[PDB]
Design a protein around this nucleic acid. Structure first.
Lengths: 205, 85, 509
RNA sequence: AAUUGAAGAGUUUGAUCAUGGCUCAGAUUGAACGCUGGCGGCAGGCCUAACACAUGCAAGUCGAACGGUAACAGGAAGAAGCUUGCUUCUUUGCUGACGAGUGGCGGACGGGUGAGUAAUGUCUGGGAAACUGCCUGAUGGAGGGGGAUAACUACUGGAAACGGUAGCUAAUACCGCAUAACGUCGCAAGACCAAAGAGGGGGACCUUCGGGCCUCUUGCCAUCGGAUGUGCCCAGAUGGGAUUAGCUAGUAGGUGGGGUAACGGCUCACCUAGGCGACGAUCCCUAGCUGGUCUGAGAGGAUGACCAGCCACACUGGAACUGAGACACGGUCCAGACUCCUACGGGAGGCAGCAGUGGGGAAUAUUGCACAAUGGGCGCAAGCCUGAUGCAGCCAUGCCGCGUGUAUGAAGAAGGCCUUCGGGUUGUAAAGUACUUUCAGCGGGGAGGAAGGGAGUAAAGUUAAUACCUUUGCUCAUUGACGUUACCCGCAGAAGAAGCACCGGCUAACUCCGUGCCAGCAGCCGCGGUAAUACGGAGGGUGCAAGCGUUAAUCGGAAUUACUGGG
């Protein structure tokens, strides 16, 4: 499953941070940001049409934290759906439980959010769920559980939770450690960051 | 063979020898009916017909000679004798 | 002792010895079973273990021939057991074969008790045997450190009562404390193949209670035990700490003369077995490297090359490894004999296929052909032998090597002839008139045309003419003519030596 | 709510444009090999010799059809040694039963296999001259008698298997007679064909005091029906080959006899001389098929294990019996091949049932547990049987989930690697610090799969009978094979858990060292003859993950047999 390597090596290769650190430092300081991803890596910015397709695929997978077979499963699922396939792709990517935990700011990083879903702390509609790849649906209340709520793990997160993005495709509390998913994410929420019209093309190469 | 169906083995043989004896009497009588039909004595044909009718239905009720065969026999052997008579 | 509830085991006893010293007979007298040494080959050609019917106690017995091929087998029958007994004749003296069987007892460091085994015979002398073994470091009775001697009769067959008491007494004097309620372990006596029951092995268990459900690891062999089967009584579920029991249902044939140990789990004993297969691959790469660096060559150094190949399957796996060594022992350098593809058990399709591919004699010991071997044999009828005794096998491989051997050596004159008066002919160029001075001249034999110890010209006698006609043979004092194709080289007073060549057919020994 | 579906690249030349093959990126598999592998869920797992097989198990069941005591469990009587009232031991079917045996039904189902089989088969759509166990609705009978016989006894042959001689004895077994339309056959008159009892309990009459007899339940029989099941027939479709072009005597048709449950050359006798054939007969080679699966934008192609329907087969070859149903996978007979045992005279066997073994092959699994559940066989039920089925074991084979830590951390540590020796990189990675403990590891708790059935009660219905039994309620005992179940709670401590291919162009990702047209790489065009981005090694990099890669296999790309869609 999980990556288990130097986080910044992905960030230099992909060409911007994936938010795998706190944000106090290290988007400009510790990182060597886009300077060179490896030893000879200073000396090239040129790239092919397959490589720009693969790089955004890798960017999206390295954001959402999913492997090629699982990511292919989301692409196939987006394909059978009516409505836009790229939009339902990004909807399936955004629809993850560990991703909603990252949006609520309960985990500071996506990896800490996945740690928090793994460790049995999360409740959805009063069910507990250990599975990282659970999907959060319309009118799903979501919370960190009462028993051992708001430990030093969650508490450290909540400070940088106070003032980053905080958008409207979730309802956010973070006082009693909960949230409510009402509206879905929509196109204007997350487009242009990703070349999505390109990414949907690539599997027919 | 190996299992206890040595009982069913002796059961079919005894019933076979029983049925064969009645089938033998059934056929010897039906040929001695058809003898009279070949002979063309219409009274001795009808007398032999009057002999076979109880026996043919009696075997039909026992079932070994079988029902619709027995009825087709009484029909067929009628059709020659009631040309002769 | 794992269970710590140890109690004396009943004794495991081995016998070594040779050439009807009562040698089969003693065991049959002890079991009171009246086999009466009636089996093929005079005395046995393989190992066996028997747990025996006796009083006051119970005892197990192991037997193997000590003969020349069986050096590891007699070592493996020696090295496991609690007590060794060494049989010796009462007739006169101790054989050079017996002191070697003493050496297998001493090198394995087991205490030993002995018996004079034919004392009722009229020309027997037990004291002679006692004195002759008082010339050796065998621990002789009284004059030496006392391996006890017993005087009893097994060749004739008269008890033996005393010997049974002596064997029990040595086992009582020894400390035989053993776990009876814990875990099971032991060694494999002899292994063979059954064609309805699978690969099987007769395994003596040292440590008590081999159970019905146990997982076993013997060397590279693994499994859970399906059932256990014995000759004293057919159906065995939980075993003793001193008894041979047949095991059945295994991956391949487990090696004779080494250790079986019960184990925690089946999955782990796959992983060990696959490590041991890696070890057999280490022994494979060792045997692959060795042959090239021993003499440079892949096989034969010198140009006079001859070999014999054989394909061998013995029924018993301890036997196949021992007698194959004895068939590679007897070889000379000139004709080399080698095994290719040693088998265990019945001849099969692929075994016959190896000797079809590369020419070899296909032999099997008590082993015989099966249907899928027969299918190859009926197509190409290779040299197929299923056998009687190992001595005749060792003779017939030697006979095959002897037939293989290059045959001729002798070069001896038939005749000497003098040349005079050359003629010329379109048949052969020149025609040397000749007069045969000594011996006989025959139509086709090698010739040496020589003057004063040099060979002037060389050949095979081409044309023998007398007077005016070609003839089959000519004898000394007679005018002849001869000419050879591309001979134009006549000098008068040169001499032809015609010579006979005679085969000998060397025989390997 | 149900039409969002189709890509190209490399490579012939000095260079170009065409034609045109070859090759690759894709998806997929009952896979193998190679290297490496922590846990879990679900699915799947001999496609080779229709080659042969050790040992165990795979359907029997009713005493409520019947003689019976061979069981052995009680009871009683009696005979006896006493414990002196009870133990004991011979009788006894009295009684809960129940082997061998007799009779009935089940054994024709399920399960396994793909040899033969190119249509007689299969699939679809139609049909007429037919039968159809058990199981249900309807209308009526269920009268009266008789003879055997196995078992069992007494003899007797056998090594064993397996028997022989003579008597005795019952039945829902067997056989006569009576009785018989709405049935069969006939135009009708008429002729003729069935029976069996068993079980529970009870007032009355009475009994050779056994039960007669009543009443209830069930079985037996005939007939008209049901639904089911199967046989039969016809049309069309359903592999390949013209270097297979001629093929058919019961062949094709008629009549009559005979035959089947029934149509019928089904089979005879006799009569006539036709039939089939370019819309591919016949012959040969080759093959189980379909609903479907896989691929494909679609059209198409390949494929038919898994799953289900159907067909065919059961050591090789053939025939019939029994029975409703078989020309019978664990029935029978005979013939054949072959295998075994033996006292040698004479006898025995068919794992393509489940396990399991030899052999084969690259290669496909545990000689497990249980009738707890579902569905069956028999039975009235209990009950018994169930290798069907429910489960477990084994295998990274496939699919899918999850982990192998998280946050901070510059002095951007040493080392490694490169280095115009200025530095750069490996690399916030490590180290260090601050945290969390899923899943494992360990100790505790605990659904559902169990509804029923059994036993006891009550009502209601029934009956001459508060009986007695069933139905319908109630109540109490219970019923888990898997099972250390799923699932939940508590504890310690980052502890136990990452590898594999590839980096010249194709194709994402680069230098140095060694070797030196050698050794080797290669899927394709191609690299190497001392400065190799293509070999070997290292460093670096990229892809992918408990798998990774190679190989084999099929479709794709291939509008490269072109209907859609070519010259």
């Amino acid at each position: 499953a999980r990556y288990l390597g130097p986080k910044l090596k992905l960030s230099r290769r992909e060409g911007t941070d994936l938010f795998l650190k706190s944000g106090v430092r290290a988007i400009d300081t510790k990182c060597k940001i886009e300077q060179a991803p490896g030893q000879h890596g200073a000396r090239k910015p040129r790239l092919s049409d397959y490589g720009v397709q693969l790089r955004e695929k890798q960017k999206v997978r390295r954001i959402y934290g999913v492997l090629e077979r699982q990511f292919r499963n989301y692409y196939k699922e987006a394909a059978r759906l009516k409505g836009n396939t790229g939009e339902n792709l990004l909807a399936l990517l955004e629809g993850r439980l560990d991703n909603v935990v990252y949006r609520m700011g309960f985990g500071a990083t996506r990896a800490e959010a996945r740690q928090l879903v793994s460790h049995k702390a999360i409740m959805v509609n009063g069910r507990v769920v250990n599975i990282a790849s659970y999907q959060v649906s319309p009118n799903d209340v979501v919370s960190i559980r009462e028993k051992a709520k708001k430990q030093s793990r969650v508490k450290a997160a909540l400070e940088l939770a106070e003032q980053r993005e905080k958008p409207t495709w979730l309802e956010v509390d973070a006082g009693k450690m909960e949230g409510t998913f009402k509206r879905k994410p929509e196109r204007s929420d997350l487009s242009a960051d990703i070349n999505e019209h390109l990414i949907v093309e690539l599997y027919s190469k | 063979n190996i299992k206890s169906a040595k009982k069913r083995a002796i059961q079919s043989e005894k019933a076979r020898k029983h049925n064969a004896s009645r089938r033998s009497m059934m056929r010897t009588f039906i040929k001695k009916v058809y003898a009279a039909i070949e002979a063309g004595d219409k009274a001795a044909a009808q007398k032999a017909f009057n002999e076979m009718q109880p026996i043919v239905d009696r075997q039909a009720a026992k079932g070994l000679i079988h029902k619709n065969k027995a009825a087709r026999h009484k029909a067929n052997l009628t059709a020659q004798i009631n040309k002769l008579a | 002792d794992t269970g710590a509830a140890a109690e004396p085991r009943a004794p495991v006893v081995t016998i070594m010895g040779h050439v009807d010293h009562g040698k089969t007979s003693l065991l049959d007298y002890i079991r009171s079973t009246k086999v009466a040494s009636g089996e093929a080959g005079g005395i046995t050609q393989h190992i066996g273990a028997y747990h025996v019917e006796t009083e006051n106690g119970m005892i197990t017995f192991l037997d193997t021939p000590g003969h020349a091929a069986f050096t590891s087998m007699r070592a493996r029958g020696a090295q496991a057991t609690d007590i060794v007994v060494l049989v010796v004749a009462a007739d006169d003296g101790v054989m050079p074969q017996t002191i070697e069987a003493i050496q297998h007892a001493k090198a394995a460091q087991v205490p030993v008790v002995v018996a004079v085994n034919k004392i009722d015979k009229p020309e027997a002398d037990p004291d002679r045997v006692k004195n002759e073994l008082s010339q050796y470091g065998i621990l002789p009775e009284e004059w030496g450190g006392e391996s006890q001697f017993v005087h009893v009769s097994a060749k004739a067959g008269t008890g033996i009562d005393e010997l049974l008491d002596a064997i029990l007494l040595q086992a009582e004097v020894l400390e035989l404390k053993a776990v009876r309620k814990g875990m099971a372990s032991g060694a494999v006596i002899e292994s063979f193949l059954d064609k309805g029951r699978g690969p099987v092995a007769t395994v003596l268990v040292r440590e008590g209670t081999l159970h019905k459900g146990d997982i076993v690891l013997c060397g590279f062999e693994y499994g859970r035990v399906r059932a256990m089967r014995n000759e004293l009584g057919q159906e065995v579920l939980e075993a003793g700490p001193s008894i041979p029991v047949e095991i059945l249902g295994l991956s391949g044939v487990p090696a004779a003369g080494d250790e079986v140990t019960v184990v925690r789990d089946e999955k782990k004993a796959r992983e060990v077995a696959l490590y041991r297969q890696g070890k057999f691959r280490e022994v494979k790469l060792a045997r692959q490297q060795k042959s090239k660096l021993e003499n440079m060559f892949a096989n034969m150094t010198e140009g006079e090359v001859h070999e014999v190949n054989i394909v061998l399957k013995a029924d018993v796996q301890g036997s196949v490894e021992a007698i194959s060594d004895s068939l590679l022992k007897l070889s000379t350098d000139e004709v080399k004999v080698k095994i290719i593809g040693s088998g265990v058990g019945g001849i099969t399709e692929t075994d016959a296929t190896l000797a079809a591919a590369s020419n070899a004699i296909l032999v099997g010991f008590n082993v015989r052909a099966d249907a899928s071997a027969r299918k190859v044999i009926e197509a190409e009828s290779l040299d197929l032998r299923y056998y009687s005794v190992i001595y005749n096998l060792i003779d017939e491989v030697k006979a095959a090597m002897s037939g293989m051997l290059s045959p001729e050596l002798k070069q001896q004159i038939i005749g000497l002839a003098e040349v005079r008066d050359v003629f010329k002919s379109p048949k052969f160029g020149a025609i040397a008139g000749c007069m045969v001075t000594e011996g006989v001249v025959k139509r086709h034999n090698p010739i040496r045309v020589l003057r004063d110890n040099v060979v002037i010209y060389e050949g095979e006698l081409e044309s023998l003419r007398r007077f005016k006609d070609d003839v089959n043979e000519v004898r000394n004092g007679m005018e002849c003519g001869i000419g050879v194709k591309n001979y134009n080289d006549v000098r008068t007073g040169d001499v032809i030596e015609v010579f006979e060549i005679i085969e000998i057919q060397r025989t390997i020994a």
